[PDB]
Amino acid sequence: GAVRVSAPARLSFTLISLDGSSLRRNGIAAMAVDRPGLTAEVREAADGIVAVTGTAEETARELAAALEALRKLWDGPAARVDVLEALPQHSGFGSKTSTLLAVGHAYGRLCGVEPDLRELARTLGRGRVSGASTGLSAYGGFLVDGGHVNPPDFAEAPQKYLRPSRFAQQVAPPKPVVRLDFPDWPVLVLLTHGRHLGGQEELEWFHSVAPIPAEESWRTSHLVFMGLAPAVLEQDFDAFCAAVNEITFTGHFKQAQIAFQGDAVADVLEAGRAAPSVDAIALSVTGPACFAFTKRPEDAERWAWELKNRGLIRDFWFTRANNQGLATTVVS
Amino acid sequence: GAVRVSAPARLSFTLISLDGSSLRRNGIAAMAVDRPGLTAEVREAADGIVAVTGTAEETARELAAALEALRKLWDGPAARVDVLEALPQHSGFGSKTSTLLAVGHAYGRLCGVEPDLRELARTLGRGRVSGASTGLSAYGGFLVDGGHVNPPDFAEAPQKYLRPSRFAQQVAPPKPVVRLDFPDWPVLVLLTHGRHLGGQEELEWFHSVAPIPAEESWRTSHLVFMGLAPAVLEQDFDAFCAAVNEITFTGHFKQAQIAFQGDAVADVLEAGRAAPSVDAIALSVTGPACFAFTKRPEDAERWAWELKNRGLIRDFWFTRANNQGLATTVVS
Ligand SMILES: O=P(O)(O)OC[C@H]1O[C@H](OP(=O)(O)OP(=O)(O)O)[C@H](O)[C@@H]1O
Ligand SMILES: O=P(O)(O)OC[C@H]1O[C@H](OP(=O)(O)OP(=O)(O)O)[C@H](O)[C@@H]1O
Ligand SMILES: Nc1c(C(=O)O)n[nH]c1C(=O)O
Ligand SMILES: Nc1c(C(=O)O)n[nH]c1C(=O)O
Ligand SMILES: [K+]
Ligand SMILES: [K+]
Ligand SMILES: [Mg+2]
Ligand SMILES: [Mg+2]
């Protein structure tokens, strides 16, 4: 028998608190979508050898390492995971956290354990900046996590803590301060020509932007918690789009992420802004995934199809929010 | 038979968004506490005459009016309500909303209806600034509501919308963006010598302070959503107290509320700040209720007892958060 696990992608609106004077750092607003999706089957490896197929090399190595670590922790069998549908790696879909937690959960189910997904994220070294994929794996929908309390030594050297996930200090994953069902609105996903960053390239860029001005952290909290989140809660489409657009085009950190990718992303965001068929548009992390909202999906479809034919984007599709998170079925 | 209803008081940390340029106005962080509490019994009035006892005159009139309005709406009997334990009126405990919703709910139960408490709040003209007592009646705990979307005509004359509850434009109550269980920490309630405001006095004061600077709205969102709320979620007492103190002593609107009451409140807040037994202290609305947090309740008890004996406060008691909201039992 196998444990078949399905999980949504994570789209990120923004990181929030990245200045040198705040009580807390990070905080992320995010939502779960069905496409791109993860589908994986976990079964007992007859030869006791951990085996992974269907993913990029980096993810395959960390999945193997995770299944070895969990084999020991839960005194369980060697597992083979066949990733039948992989989340695109390093594309703004939170692929690694979402895949590790889904496969870890499915392996848990094989072993007769039901792991706390946040505790499993901690076990696998996730959540040192973002609790987004961790929270959305458990709950789906729209969430804003509370980031991380800044220790007493933060103020004297903030760049010790204000880092990308790969270089961030060891801490537990944040918990969700806000978790809501996303309204039954369609989401337009655009794959831009944006590049994948190098680890050292990203760390140097991050230290060139953070710490951001205190007032910009505050304004970002304001746009997320007193703009995005209430509009989701009240299913107010026009209010939601105004908040998304204010973050995309004026968010200090988000503008830095856009500028780092350059025209490959900025031209698509500008085209979305000019297009009457697109009510709001956003870059997830540094992309290449962008996402858009529309009360005229029929028109936005034709606009995206033309952009793809012209080669200004790689791909586009409509999806809907996932309001559950991961699901599992036992199959042959 | 009677419907016996018990409900907690509402303590307010701060109003959030009160500037002339924001997407939304208001937003309130609040928590429910057991003491002061409401206890009321609702029964059928044999003579078909709506009767209220146990409250101040203003509350008794609005309760009678509410029970008349609901008698018609639900085609039910005339009700007598005996308020056996009243929430102190105009003292920072959200007495009117909390009492109207509890008695309305209990009357509902008498009529064989289970009303949506937020819709009942709308019916009774509550929630034009604060969704705090409305949300806490339903859920208890700690909550931050999302305030109200600012209409297109807001920017040209913000004082049309930025008003106290009594003078605010007709709108539905806000919904909770954040709702959490409060940790099992004790709360010290202090009744100061603060005065009750007049309606015209409050409206003129409010227009003298609002609209507040945009940056102060943003910083208040930051302290509430990226300070108070994550510390509640993570049950981090020191982080919680740092956020409470930053709001009390630096919050732009809160400082204006303190200054309007003067030494009667400011001296108690300053005494709490200086006192090693008090880790954090706060004014609920304009008071006279203040509330405090301590990891040394034994020491804070002796400190409050001395303040009361000296006459710097009227009263003090320890209570705990209510994590349920209103409850009802059918009695003889
Ligand atoms: O734990 P999470 O909420 O997923 O957030 C952390 C990860 O997400 C971002 O990359 P991206 O969205 O591109 O995901 P990936 O790098 O795992 O594919 C970031 O670069 C981290 O790699
Ligand atoms: O709907 P709510 O969340 O209760 O908030 C609205 C009411 O609360 C404040 O007064 P206060 O806390 O003193 O309550 P009261 O004036 O009803 O007693 C404010 O002056 C409003 O009167
Ligand atoms: N989640 C992230 C984001 C984001 O969501 O924008 N940027 N950096 C990170 C990170 O984890 O390093
Ligand atoms: N709830 C309020 C507060 C508060 O909680 O501080 N100040 N004014 C109001 C109001 O309703 O007018
Ligand atoms: K547009
Ligand atoms: K103190
Ligand atoms: Mg990444
Ligand atoms: Mg009042």
Automatic annotation (TrEMBL), chains A, B:
<dbReference type="InterPro" id="IPR020568">
    <property type="entry name" value="Ribosomal_Su5_D2-typ_SF"/>
</dbReference>
<protein>
    <submittedName>
        <fullName>Beta-ribofuranosylaminobenzene 5'-phosphate synthase</fullName>
    </submittedName>
</protein>
<dbReference type="GO" id="GO:0005524">
    <property type="term" value="F:ATP binding"/>
</dbReference>
<keyword id="KW-0547">Nucleotide-binding</keyword>
<dbReference type="InterPro" id="IPR013750">
    <property type="entry name" value="GHMP_kinase_C_dom"/>
</dbReference>
<keyword id="KW-0418">Kinase</keyword>
<feature type="domain" description="GHMP kinase C-terminal">
    <location>
        <begin position="229"/>
        <end position="302"/>
    </location>
</feature>
<dbReference type="Pfam" id="PF08544">
    <property type="entry name" value="GHMP_kinases_C"/>
</dbReference>
<dbReference type="InterPro" id="IPR036554">
    <property type="entry name" value="GHMP_kinase_C_sf"/>
</dbReference>
<dbReference type="InterPro" id="IPR004422">
    <property type="entry name" value="RFAP_synthase"/>
</dbReference>
<feature type="domain" description="GHMP kinase N-terminal">
    <location>
        <begin position="65"/>
        <end position="132"/>
    </location>
</feature>
<keyword id="KW-0067">ATP-binding</keyword>
<keyword id="KW-0808">Transferase</keyword>
<dbReference type="InterPro" id="IPR014721">
    <property type="entry name" value="Ribsml_uS5_D2-typ_fold_subgr"/>
</dbReference>
<dbReference type="GO" id="GO:0016301">
    <property type="term" value="F:kinase activity"/>
</dbReference>
<dbReference type="Pfam" id="PF00288">
    <property type="entry name" value="GHMP_kinases_N"/>
</dbReference>
<dbReference type="InterPro" id="IPR006204">
    <property type="entry name" value="GHMP_kinase_N_dom"/>
</dbReference>
